[PDB]
Write a protein that binds this ligand. Sequence first.
Ligand SMILES: N[C@@H](Cc1ccc(CC(F)(F)F)cc1)C(=O)O
Length: 308
Amino acid sequence: DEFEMIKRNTSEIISEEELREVLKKDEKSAIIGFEPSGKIHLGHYLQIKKMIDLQNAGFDIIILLADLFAYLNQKGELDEIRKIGDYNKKVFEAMGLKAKYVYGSSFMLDKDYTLNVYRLALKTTLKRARRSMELIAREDENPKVAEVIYPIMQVNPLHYEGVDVAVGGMEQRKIHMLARELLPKKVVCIHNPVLTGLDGEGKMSSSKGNFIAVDDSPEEIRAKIKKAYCPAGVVEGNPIMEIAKYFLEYPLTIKRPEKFGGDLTVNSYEELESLFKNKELHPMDLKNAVAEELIKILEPIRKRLLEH
Ligand SMILES: N[C@@H](Cc1ccc(CC(F)(F)F)cc1)C(=O)O
């Protein structure tokens, strides 16, 4: 099913009935926005993989390099942000994405864009804007006015003209709930889960420095994975298991020494999860398998980012 391919590994689709209608049409487009990021990590790639799914299913793909948004979220000066955006777009092309790339600031300063922001600032409460940003806003002991403008710009109808589907992480869902209420035409949201960071502390993050970057060296992936929170028998909160779920190909053959049980062949992640949960498979053989298949999945991307 095209539908079930798109739905595989998302946390929610709002809504499924509207997505079946979109899939019927001959012309459909899907958008995702990203604040430019100094490092692109597996959190980014999970979402790019969803966009490749939509692209296989017939959708035109639009990537918004959300530079002004990064600007409001205190990531720096704009033309410095627009140069990080340029690099991120190289990375997304090396992931195998066939898309159109738009810089926010190329249209977000237009008079009609600006008037919608003022119009929406009239319908949106300070309390709701702030709630909507709890998972997104840069850490700040004295919150700035910029924090409450960010979500109203994210739900501006100009971002969604001729767009059927928006894709984002679950950390964006309150902002999308706002847009569901306030947008003139309905857009389907597809939310992808948030990856746990390597120490299990919170969520994977370019500023928490708890991530694996797609351009990481092999030795580097090994060392991050070796150090990673992965309690025996525990799946919930375990970032090594998450990587197994969202990134690996099954059936999976796990090489191990014959004293640890010999080569193991798992035909599904659900099979891996039962093996792991009852301790027929130890963190260390998991880790070696995950590290080794992660290296092979990332290699072509590291290669073209390094080509020259
Ligand atoms: N909040 C996102 C960035 C963002 C996501 C979505 C949009 C609207 C749209 F998706 F681009 F159309 C604008 C910016 C993030 O946290 O990177």
